[PDB]
Design a protein around this ligand. Structure first.
Ligand code: TYD
Ligand code: TYD
Lengths: 184, 184
């Protein structure tokens, strides 16, 4: 007699989902994705073709990522630990171009963020370790991958970090927002 | 060179998958599903409509489950702990009717099993806890759910468990193979 919750964020095309969880004498059960319910909430058809799975230590930051062609909508969640997850609008024609929203997603709260094509995405690990799962609307295309650097001074993203983040080299070498390839 | 691995089991429609895992000083990354790679391995198109997530304590056994109409193919894996996973051929006309295959799937080995429509499915938890994920080709339909009891004496499933399993009331009340609704 409860149900899945869907809430549009300050940038309305980004949606926060919360599944209905059933507990019992064995442990728990929930639907982590349902095509019908998801499409009703979004307002249009979306099909996914790839699922990705990462594990990251405390302080690791991955992002800010997007594919400029073969763009990927992303439905993301955390199945171990806790992350702060961020979406940045990179559509030049949008009234919220260059704005961002962020939410805490954890194994415990079971919250998910749907981040459509046209956005950049990243997360930082708050717990000892985190494992992060996501579904993508199109395939990996390394030639089309682009990166904006986490601490870009125009975006002004407030990551909850204690010391310097642990970054890959590609991410450490991300471009400035002012130099970045953006969507129409 | 390394890549995704796929191996047909003794009932050849059941496929054991193992992803290629990329490790670095942050942790790891892998594709847990890729529709191209999957369809190429099984030899036909597939569409998944629901993802499910459960948590279960040591000794818990769920199964043996199937839907007789709106039948669901299932791609299953473990993201925490270890289970013994079982697929049973319930297609009365099949040359392997009433046979079963089983494999150990764990968070660490990352193995997955593809169990097509027409099979019954079950697993037993061997670790402190296990979290089990699965994708389905059709939606949950409780009116069409059926169950065969875990210890049916004709199927003769060799569960690698020491003491008795913990079952739900539904699963304790599973039908005998001899009395069960089967597929043609
Ligand atoms: C995003 C992605 C990465 N990968 C591979 C490429 C890399 O070898 C590894 C990790 O990706 P990435 O974080 O880009 O690593 P690196 O900083 O070393 O380039 O996973 C896939 O196979 N599929 C994918 O969809
Ligand atoms: C399999 C499944 C179960 N459920 C619900 C039905 C139940 O209320 C709960 C647990 O499933 P189940 O184990 O079938 O019920 P029970 O615990 O009574 O044996 O999850 C879904 O919402 N979607 C699904 O796909």
């Amino acid at each position: 007699s409860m149900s899945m919750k869907a809430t549009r964020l300050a940038i309305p095309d980004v949606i926060l989902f919360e599944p209905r969880v059933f507990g019992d004498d064995r442990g728990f059960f929930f639907e982590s994705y349902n095509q019908r319910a998801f499409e009703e909430a979004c307002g249009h058809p979306v099909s996914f073709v790839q699922d990705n799975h990462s594990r990251s230590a405390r302080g690791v930051l991955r992002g800010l990522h997007y594919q400029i062609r073969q763009a990927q909508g992303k439905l993301v969640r955390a199945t171990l630990g806790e992350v702060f997850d961020v979406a940045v609008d990179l559509r030049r024609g949008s009234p919220t171009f260059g704005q961002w929203v962020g939410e805490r997603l954890s194994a415990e709260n079971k919250r998910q963020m749907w981040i459509p094509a046209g956005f950049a995405h990243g997360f930082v690990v708050l717990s000892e370790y985190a494992e992060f799962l996501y579904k993508t609307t199109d395939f990996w295309a390394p030639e089309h991958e682009r990166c904006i650097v986490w601490n870009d001074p125009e975006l002004k993203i407030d990551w909850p970090l204690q010391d310097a983040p642990l970054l890959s080299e590609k991410d450490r070498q991300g471009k400035a927002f002012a130099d970045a390839d953006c969507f129409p």
